[PDB]
Amino acid sequence: GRSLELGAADIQDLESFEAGRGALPARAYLQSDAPRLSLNGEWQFRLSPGSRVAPDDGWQLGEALNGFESLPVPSSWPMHGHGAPAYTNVQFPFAVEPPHVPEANPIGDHLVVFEAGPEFFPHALLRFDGIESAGTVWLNGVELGTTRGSRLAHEFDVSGILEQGENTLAVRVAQFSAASYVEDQDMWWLPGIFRDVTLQARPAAGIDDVFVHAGYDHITGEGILKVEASRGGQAIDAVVRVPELALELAAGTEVRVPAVEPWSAEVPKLYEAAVSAAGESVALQIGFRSIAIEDAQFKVNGRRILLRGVNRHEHHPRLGRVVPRDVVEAELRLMKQHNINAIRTSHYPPHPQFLALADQLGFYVVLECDLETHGFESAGWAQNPSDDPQWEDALVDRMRRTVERDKNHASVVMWSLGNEAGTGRNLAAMSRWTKDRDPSRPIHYEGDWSSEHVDVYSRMYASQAETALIGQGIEPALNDAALDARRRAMPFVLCEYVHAMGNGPGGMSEYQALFEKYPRLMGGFVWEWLEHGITVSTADGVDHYGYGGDFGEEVHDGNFVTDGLVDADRRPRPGLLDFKKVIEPLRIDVARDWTGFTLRNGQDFADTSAFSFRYEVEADGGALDGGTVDVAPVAPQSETVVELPGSVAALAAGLSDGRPAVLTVRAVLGADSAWADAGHEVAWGQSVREPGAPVPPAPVEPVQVQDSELTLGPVVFSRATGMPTSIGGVPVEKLGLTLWWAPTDNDLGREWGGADERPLATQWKDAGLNRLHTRLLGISANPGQDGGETLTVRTRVSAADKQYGVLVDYTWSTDGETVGLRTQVRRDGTWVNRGFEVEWARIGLEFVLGEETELVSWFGQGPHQSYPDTGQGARAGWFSLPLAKMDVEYVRPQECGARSGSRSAALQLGGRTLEICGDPFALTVRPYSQDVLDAAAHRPDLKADGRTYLYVDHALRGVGTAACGPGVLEQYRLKPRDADFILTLKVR
Amino acid sequence: GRSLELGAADIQDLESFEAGRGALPARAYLQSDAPRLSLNGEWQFRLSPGSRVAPDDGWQLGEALNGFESLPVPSSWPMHGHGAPAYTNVQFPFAVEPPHVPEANPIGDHLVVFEAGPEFFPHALLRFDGIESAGTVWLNGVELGTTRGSRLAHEFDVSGILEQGENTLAVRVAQFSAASYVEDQDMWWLPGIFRDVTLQARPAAGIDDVFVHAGYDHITGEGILKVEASRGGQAIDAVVRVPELALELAAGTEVRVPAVEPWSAEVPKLYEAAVSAAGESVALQIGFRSIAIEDAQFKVNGRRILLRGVNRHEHHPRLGRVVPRDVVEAELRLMKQHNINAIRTSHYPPHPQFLALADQLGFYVVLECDLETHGFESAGWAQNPSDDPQWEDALVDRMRRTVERDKNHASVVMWSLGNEAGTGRNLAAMSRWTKDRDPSRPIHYEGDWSSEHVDVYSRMYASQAETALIGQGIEPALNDAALDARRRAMPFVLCEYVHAMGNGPGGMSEYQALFEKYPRLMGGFVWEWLEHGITVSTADGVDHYGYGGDFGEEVHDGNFVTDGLVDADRRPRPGLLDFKKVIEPLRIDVARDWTGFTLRNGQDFADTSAFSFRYEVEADGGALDGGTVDVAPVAPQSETVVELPGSVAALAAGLSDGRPAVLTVRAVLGADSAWADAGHEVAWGQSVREPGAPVPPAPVEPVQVQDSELTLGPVVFSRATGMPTSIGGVPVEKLGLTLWWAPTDNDLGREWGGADERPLATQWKDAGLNRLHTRLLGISANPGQDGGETLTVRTRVSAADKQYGVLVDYTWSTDGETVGLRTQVRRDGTWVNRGFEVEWARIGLEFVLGEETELVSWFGQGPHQSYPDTGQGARAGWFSLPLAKMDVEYVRPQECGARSGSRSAALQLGGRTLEICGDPFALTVRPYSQDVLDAAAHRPDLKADGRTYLYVDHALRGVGTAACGPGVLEQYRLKPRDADFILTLKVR
Ligand SMILES: O=[N+]([O-])c1ccccc1O[C@@H]1O[C@H](CO)[C@H](O)[C@H](O)[C@H]1O
Ligand SMILES: O=[N+]([O-])c1ccccc1O[C@@H]1O[C@H](CO)[C@H](O)[C@H](O)[C@H]1O
Ligand code: NA
C-alpha cells in the first residue's frame, strides 16, 4: 500500500521541530562599509491556499510565470488584497495538534530579479530580517535553506550561486507552520516578507560579528571598554577608534577610559566609534552603562531607576507589520514627549533599525525573544512547546538570534525569554544560554512566577494591593524555601499594567504612588502603546478602523486588538494624556497662598537645569500676571521650595471672594532636544481660588396655569408629564434621571473576585438600568417670595419587572432671569437583583434639547475628558471646543467625553446660549442618544439625529481597568444612595 | 399647595384594589328564552396613550366625534393596527409597584349606537363577557360601572337608563390597571373588548341563576338530580322537565332517577332539560357524574380515570384573544382525533361557549380562575397580591365569577384557584369560598406545594424520577406532620409536563409508563396545546409567524410564546403525532410469529365495541394480505389474545429471509362519531421482518491514478483532499464527519442540576462543535479482490484552539455497480472543555451534493420525523415525500426532519436517483446548510442555495424538554466514543 496524497513533502518540512536549515551563524546587525544592495521594491507574487496544491512548476526560475502579480516587498500580504487580516487573542486559529498544520494554509510564492555587480564577488550573502512564518529560499533555482522565527534575522551564503549580472531570487512563504505554535501573540496573523531583504558583499579580511562591552564605574567615573570582533567565528585582529575619548585600542582587550559621561535614558550619551580590519570597517554608537541588582533594586550606573514604560508592538493601519521608519521616529519622539523613558518589545524583537533609535533618543528597553505559547494554557499546558524536549533546538535558536542581533546596544537593559509561554525545560535552557553569552544584562520572564530562571520578579496586572505587598517584600512566600529566598531578593517589575483598552485606564495614580514609595518596585509598562486598528474604506468613502471579526474570521477576539494609548495612526487617546501627567518626572506642589511652590526632582540622574519654570495666573478674561522664576538646579531625588514673585501672592489676596482664578506653574524645555522644541511642557502644578456657590434666584415670578401647560418665568412645563418643554425658547424634548451609561470596554470585562462573575455591563442589563421609566406622582406650586412660587414635580424612576426605585423631586424657582433647579433623590426599596447589589454608573440628569449644539464651553477640568479614577492630565482652566471635538473617537464607541469637576458651562445653540452653573458636576454633550452610542459597534454607526443630549452628573463611577486586571477601585465605585444637588440655568 | 397634574381621577380608579363597581351579582351563563340583542359588529374607536391625555370631551354621547374610526368588537385591538402585540413571559412590562400603573398606558375609547325594541322593556341588562383589563361603561352618558377580571363576565342593570329606540353605549378601556398585577400569564398582552357584548331583556317572573346538581350512584346506577333556580338571589318556584328520563319535578328538590347512563369523556351522555317559570325558560344539558377522591385516587363514577390532557390557551394568529367558534369546534375535534380526553384552561376561564362543547365532545376540564402573580417571584414574593389583605375582595370576586359562570357543566371536574401566584391568605380565602359554594368538584392549585388548601397534589414538569417516587407515595415528607398526612392521601396530577417547545417533546413514553403503573398518578396536561404565533405579512407577501420582540417590545421573551403541539393555525407539529400514539387508549402488541396480538383496553369506561380491528401486511411493492378480525369486546382494563387469520402467519413463515415486510394491526372507528368519520385510527401496533444487512460489494474494480484525481469505479476522488468529488455523475462538493446540529429550543435551555449551567447549545459553541475542521493524514490503495483495490482515506477532525479530536478512516470498495463505504471513528484526546465533558449531537456524515433534490424515499420509521426520545408516532413502513415536506416549519427554525431507524433511502436528483443502504441510520435531507439553519431566526431567513445536504447518522442525541423541565434522559444522551459503521451507495 503506497501513499497517494499530494504535497506530503512540503508538509513534513512545515511540521518540523528543527530550526531553519543551512543559514550562516547568528550575528549582530552591524553598520558596515561593505557594499549592500537592498532587494526591496516590487516583487512578483502567487498565492496558493495550501501546500497540497502549491504548484511545483519551476516558478523559482523566473520563466513562464502563470498567475503572478506585482506585490511590494517588504509587505504583510493580507494588507494588499491577498486574503485578509485575522485577529485572535489567545485562541489558535487552527486545531491544536503540534506540530501539524491545517489544510487551509496560504502559500505565498515570491520572486524578484536583481542585478549583481562586481562589488558582490567573489563572496556575498542574502539577508532576510523577517519572514512570517516559514520561508524556503532559492537563488537561481538552487535551495539556500529555510527560515524559522518570524521576527528573527537569517543570512544565507550565496558564494558560488550568486552569478554576475542578473539573478533570480525565489522565496516560498507558508503562513502556518510548527512555528505558529510558538508565535501566538495577541495580534493580527499577517504572513509575508515584512522586513528588509538585502544582498551584502563579504570581502576578505572582513568583520562578521562585533560584541561591544561598555561599562561604567560610578564611583570613579571610568569607562570600561572592550570591543570584540570576529570573522568566521574566530577572534580577529581589528583596531578600535573612538575619536572623542582620545583612544585607539586593539579589539579583544579591556581598557579603563579615565572619565566618561555615562549613558541613561535621561542623558543618552553616545560616543561614535569604529572597529575596522583590512577589508571592512564597522560603525558603532557606544553607551557606557552598567546594570546591576543589589538590595533588591534594579540599578543603572549605581542609581535605582524608575521605569516609565509602554509595550511597543509593531503595527501600521494599512501596512500591517511593516512600520515605515518615519512612523518609527515619530512615535518614539511622541513617547518622549509624554515623559516615557522605557519600552518593552512585546513580544518579539523589533525592526533592526529600532535599536539605534532607542540608543539615541533615550529608553530603557526590554528586548524580548519571539516566543509565546499562550494557546496551550486552556489545556493545562499539555503539549506545551516550552517543555517538549523536541523544541529545545528551535527555542534556543530563537534566543540566540534574538540576543546576537542586538547585544551591542546600550538601550537594552534586559533580555526577555518571551511571554505567556508557561514554564518548562526549554525556557530554562534559553536562560542558561543567555547568562552564558551575555552576563551584562539581567533576564526577564513573567510566566514562571517561581522566578527560578530569571533575575527580576515580573508580573502582569498585579493589583495595586499585591503591588504594595511586594513593595514591602511581604508577599506570600514561595513553597520552595530556596527559591523564595532568591525571589525576595529580586526587584519587581510590572511588564504589563493599567490595561488601556477604551475609556481608561483608571487607577494609574494609585500604582505610581507605590513606585515612588518603594524602591524594590521598578515601575511598569502600560499595555499597550498603540491600537492595532486596520483602516477600512466604506462605500461612502468614510474611513474607520476595523478589528477582530470585521475581516471574516471564524474565530476572533473582537476589539481586544485595539487596546492602546494611541490609535493606529498614533493619534493620542486621553489615556496617554493622563499617563503623561502621572509619570511626570518632577512634581510641582503650588502653595495655597500663592507665595511659592515645592519642586521635587524625580529623575534618577539629571538635575533641573534643562527646564524653564514659567508661571501664569488666569482669570475669567485673559491672563493677569505671568513670567519666569529662576531655580537653582536641584539634584535627582532632592527638593527645594522656590519663591514666586510677590505680585502673584498679592494678586490672590486681593481677589474679591468668589472670583475664580488659577495659578499654573509649568516646567518646560529651556532649549530644543532631540525629541521636542523649546517650551515643551514636562511637568506642571496648580492652585485654584474657586468660585463661590451660585446664588439661587429669588422666587419672585409666579406659576401661570393654562389648561395644557404651566409657565414659570422662562420655562414651559407640560401638565401631563411635569417636565419642562422649553426654557427661553430652547425646545426641551425630555428631562429625566440617569443612572446608566453606554458600557466601556472595562465594563464589558469580568471583574474577578466576588461571586458575581457577570461583567458590570451585564449586571446593568439584568438590573434594567438601561431601560428606566418615570412615573409622575404629583405637581404643586408652593409659596415663594413676594407673590412668586416654587414648582415641585414629584416622580419615581424604576424599570419594568423591578421593585426597587428612586424618588426624584424637581423643584423650580425663577426671578425671570435665571431658573433655579433643586433635585433630590431618595432610594425606595433595596437595589438588589439576581442576588447582587446594583451599582450605578452615575447620579445625574439628561436634558434632550430640540436643537443642535455648535459649541461647548466650561470652567473646570480639561480640556480632554475626566472621570473619578482618570483625568489627572486634565487641569483647571477655561475651555471651549466645537461639539465634535468633545467626543472621543474610540473604535468601538462607548461612554466618553465627560468633563468632571465642572463649575459652569455654556452650550451655543443656534443663536442663543444655555448657561448652567452649580456645585461640581460632570458635563457631557453629544449629538446622539446613549442608546445609539451603546448599539454602535463602529464609529460610522453613530448618526446625529438633530438634537442635543446634555448630561449633568452629580456623581460618577470610575472606569477602572476590568477588561484586563483590576476593576474600578473601592473609593471610586458608585453604590446607590440618597443625593441632593442644586443647579442654576440661564438662556441669553 | 394645590395639585396641578392632569388625569389624577382616572388613575386613582385604575389603581384601585376594589373589584368592579355597580354590576349585578355573578351568575351562570344560561341558555334562556328571553330576548337578546348582540351588540357585536363595527364600533367606533379612539386610542389615547395615557389617562393624563385621554380626552374628557363628552365622547360618551356619540355627537361630534373627533378622532374615531371603525373597529370590530369583539377585538383584541393591537391586532387591528392600534399599537402592537407585546409578549412577556414572567417579566412584567412595567415597574413593579402595585397598584400603580405606568404613564404609558393605552386608553381605548369604544362607542356603539344600537336600537332597543319593546322586547327590552321595562327591564334589561348589558353583558360583557370579557374586557382586558379595566373598563368603564356608560349608557347614554350615564355611568353603569367598571369591570375587573379580564376573562370574567360582568352584567349591568340598564333599567331606567336604556331608552326606547336608539341608545349610545360607551366603554373606556385601559390596557393596564392594578388588575394587570394579577393577570401576568405567559401570553401576549392584548387589550380590548375581546368577548361578546350583549343586551338581554329581563322579564318579570324570570330565572337569573340556575345550579344543576347531577350525580351518579355507581353501585345502583341511579341519577341524583336537583336543579336549583333563583331570581334576585332567592329560591323561586320553577318546573324541571327532562323528557328523556320521563320526569317532571320541582326545582329545589333532590330526586333519585332510577337508572341513568353516566357521563364521562369517553361516553359524554347528555340529557336535554329545561327549567322554566312564568317569564323565562332555561335550557340545560345534564351529565350525571360524581367526582370523588378515595385511596389517594381521583375517581369519576367509581373508576380511577387517567388524564390525557393539554393546556388550552385562547389565541388566534390574526385576531389575538378572539377565537372564532368554527376554530373552537375544529381544534376540539382535532384534540379528540389525537386521543386527548382532558383540557386545562390555562390560565383563565375560556369563552362561555367553550363549556358546552366540552360537555358534548367529551373532556375532563380543569376550570381555572383568572389569577396569576408570577412576576412577583423574582423579588421573593414581596408585595405578592395573593397575600396582601387589600386584594382579598378583588381575588374572591375573581373566584366567585369563575365558579358561578360554569358551575352547571359536567365536563368541569376541578376548580383551579389560578396559577403561578405564590402562597397566601387570599388563595386560602378563594379555596374556602369554593368548597362552600360547590362541594362537588375538588380544588386544584399548584403554587403551594404544601397543598394545604387543595384536594389534589399538583406539580409542573416534575421529573420522571420524582413522578415515580410520588406514584409510590414515597416522596420526601412535608415538614408539618399534619399537612404531610393530608398530601400523601391526595392523588397526584401534572398540570404541565413534557414542555412541547420546538423539536420535541422527548421523554413522553417514560412519563406514560408511570401513569399506567401507579394509580395515585392521575396523568398530565402537555404544555401547551398551541403556539401563539402571530402572522406577519412581509414586503414580498410571504407569510410567517412572529413572536416576542418582533413587534417592538422593550422587554420580551422571544419565541417562548410558540411552545405548542399545534401552530397558531392548528397545523399539527410532530409532537402531537407522537403524543397521540403515547396516550393511545388501547395497546396492540403484535406477536413475533404473526399469529395474533394482545389487546389491552386502557379506557376507564368504554369497551372495545366501538372499534374495527383491521390488519395489513405490506411488502416492498404493495400489500400482500389484509382484512378484519372480530374481537369479542374486552372490558376496560381487561386483556385478551386475539388470533389473526392463518394466512398472515403462513405468509411470514414463507418469506425468503432478508425480505422486509410489516404487519400492522390497526384499531379504527367502526362508525362516525361526533369528532371523526368511520375508519379514523385510534391505536395501532406492528411486527417487522427486517431486511438482512446489505452485501458489501466485491472489490473487483481497481483505483485509477491521474495526477489530479483518483477514480475507483463510479466515484471520483480529489487527491488533494481525499474526499469524493462525484459518484455516478452526481457532484459531491463536500463530505465529512458531523458531531453537531443546529440547536433546538431545548438545547437553548439551561438544564438544572450539574455544575454546568450553560445550555447544551452554549456547551457546543464553547467546545467548537459547530466549526469543525478536517486535516488529511494519508491516502492509500490496498489489495482488494481479483485485481481490484480498496481505498483508505485517513483524516482527523477537530476544531481551532482545541486539543481533542477524532480520527476518521474512510474505506471504499467497488465492483462497478455499488460503492461500499466503511467509516471508523476513534477518539484522540479527552473530549473535555471549560471543565465539563463535551457531548455530541450525532455521529454521522454530511454529503453536500452539487444538484438539487426533488424527492426523498426511505424504508424505516415515518412518515414524520423521529429522534431517540421521540418518534413514537412514526411507524415502520415505506415512505416517499417531496423535499420541502421533509422539513418542519417551526417558527424559529432549528434541527428537525431526521427520520431515525432508516434502512434504505433514495434521493431523486434531477434524472438520477441515489440509493443508500446499510444498517440503521438516521436520514435527513435539506436544501440549505446547517449554519444557514442555525443563523435563521424566522422561516424566511432559510434560502435554498441550489445544493443538497444529505445527513446519514449512525448515532443521535435525544431532544429532551430542557427548555422547561427535564433535559435529554441518560439513556438518550450521546457521549463521545469510538464507532464503526458500514454504508453501501448506488446511482441509477
Ligand atoms: O495574563 N492574563 O492572565 C490574561 C488574562 C486574560 C486575557 C489576557 C491575558 O494576558 C495578557 O493580555 C494582554 C492584553 O490584552 C496582552 O495580550 C498580553 O500579551 C497578555 O499577556
Ligand atoms: O414553573 N417554573 O419553575 C418555570 C420556570 C421557568 C420558566 C417558566 C416556568 O413556569 C411555567 O412555564 C410554562 C411554559 O413556558 C408556562 O408559562 C406556565 O404557565 C408556567 O407555569
Ligand atoms: Na489585547
Ligand code: NA
Ligand atoms: Na411559554
